[PDB]
Design an enzyme around this catalytic site. Structure first.
Site, PDB file in Angstrom:
ATOM      1  CB  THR A   1      -0.919  -0.007   1.229  1.00 45.23           C
ATOM      2  OG1 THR A   1      -1.608  -1.260   1.301  1.00 45.23           O
ATOM      3  CG2 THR A   1      -1.960   1.113   1.148  1.00 45.23           C
ATOM      4  CB  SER A   2       0.387   4.558  -1.546  1.00 49.07           C
ATOM      5  OG  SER A   2       0.972   5.836  -1.457  1.00 49.07           O
TER       6      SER A   2
ATOM      7  N   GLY B   1       8.444  -1.871   7.057  1.00 49.73           N
ATOM      8  CA  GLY B   1       9.561  -2.679   7.507  1.00 49.73           C
ATOM      9  C   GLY B   1       9.100  -3.906   8.259  1.00 49.73           C
TER      10      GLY B   1
ATOM     11  CB  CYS C   1       5.742  -2.493  10.927  1.00 45.50           C
ATOM     12  SG  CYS C   1       4.293  -1.506  10.474  1.00 45.50           S
TER      13      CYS C   1
END
Lengths: 5, 140, 93, 91, 141, 5
Positions: E29-30, E89, E130
């Protein structure tokens, strides 16, 4: 005399 | 701001000092650790902690000790301190008979699991290897 | 409410992945230094700043001595991991 | 001689293993709070104490709002990892 | 000295790697709102007298090359070094626009033996990403 | 409008 843990 | 440290008691300081390991672990005895445990006992006694020294615990005894301590009523204690002296690897501390994950020990004191330590500082001091990499240093 | 992982401090003797060193007579570098800094500074400094002095003492003053060249002349930096939400002073007033 | 890993500071937005939350229009909770506390305290406090205020701001003022119940009402604590050997003052 | 020396001629560099749009091959996702983060960081670190360098949507190979290049600069006149990573991440991993990069690979270019003009100086890495998929449900106080 | 990273 230094050892590792 | 800062943690309230003027509860009736500073809190517990648990010192787990593992010196002698079953040689089926492959680990060697940790000479000098007794000097560490004694130094820690005196240091935290001067800070007014009730120090509990534990020697050569199996991983089952570590898990059971941490569970029992987390179930005590810490309502009148400002904080909690736990010192682990042993062999280890990344994420892992050794009982005398093998490894145990650090997260399993610390999860007992989570904010939702140990309600009488909620909002209070929980300090874990870990003397143990975290792998086998070597720091050769750099001269200045 | 607060995160369930908040208000933990993990004072590691060494950086992630690394050996931690212990003098076979005098004790581990980290615990020696930690006790010395608490004795000197527990009534003057916040805990993180005490631990930062432990970091400096271990980093600068200790180098391994081993009869095995692979473990000789090695260095250590401790690793402070803080999820604390407030400053921690051991003394009072 | 100093360790080669000395004098690093890793200011992570979240605890090991955990998600990190971001507001789709105001930015991540962590960077929002970090910039706020640096603006307010970089001329008064040592960096580790600034990051401790960031820890508190994220921990206490933020909670997730999600139309997906799995991700709603969630919390976050940042994670300061210091291999520094000295205090760091921006003034 | 108990305090890092902060009166070099320059405070130092502040590298901001802002990854908003990821490759369709990743499926990621953007990251809406990250532009607000990058602009806040640019302004905050400008007021601390850092030389801010904003970088947008870098691949995993562009991040490594950027970090290698910066670590081979001459930081002798700089007091510190700051790097800010805004991306997705996992534990120990930051994502380029096209896949993962080990954080250790990034920070290793600045080790005290590999970046001599930063030896003894504060190297700060600020990581918004993350670190897993665990969820903190919190506890009411 | 909170999302994960």
């Amino acid at each position: 005399i230094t050892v590792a843990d | 701001n800062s943690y309230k440290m003027d509860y009736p008691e500073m809190g517990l300081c648990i010192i787990i000092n593992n010196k002698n390991f079953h040689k089926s672990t492959g680990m060697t005895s940790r000479s000098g650790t007794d000097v560490d445990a004694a130094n820690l006992r005196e240091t935290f006694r001067n800070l007014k902690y009730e120090v509990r020294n534990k020697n050569d615990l199996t991983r089952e005894e570590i898990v059971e000790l941490m569970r029992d301590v987390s179930k005590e009523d810490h309502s009148k204690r400002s904080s909690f301190v736990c010192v682990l002296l042993s062999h280890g690897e990344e994420g892992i501390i050794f009982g005398t008979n093998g490894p145990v994950d650090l997260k399993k020990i610390t999860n007992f004191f989570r904010g939702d699991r140990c309600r009488s330590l909620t909002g209070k500082p929980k300090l874990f001091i870990i003397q143990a290897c975290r792998g086998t990499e070597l720091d050769c240093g750099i001269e200045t | 409410k607060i995160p369930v992982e908040a208000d933990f401090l993990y004072a590691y003797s060494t950086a992630p992945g690394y050996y931690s060193w212990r003098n076979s007579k005098d004790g581990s570098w980290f615990i020696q230094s930690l006790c010395a800094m608490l004795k000197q500074y527990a009534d003057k400094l916040e805990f993180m700043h005490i631990l930062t002095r432990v970091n400096r003492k271990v980093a600068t003053e200790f180098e391994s001595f081993s009869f095995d060249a692979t473990f000789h002349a090695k260095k250590q930096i401790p690793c402070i991991v803080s999820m604390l939400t407030k400053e921690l002073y051991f003394y009072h007033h």
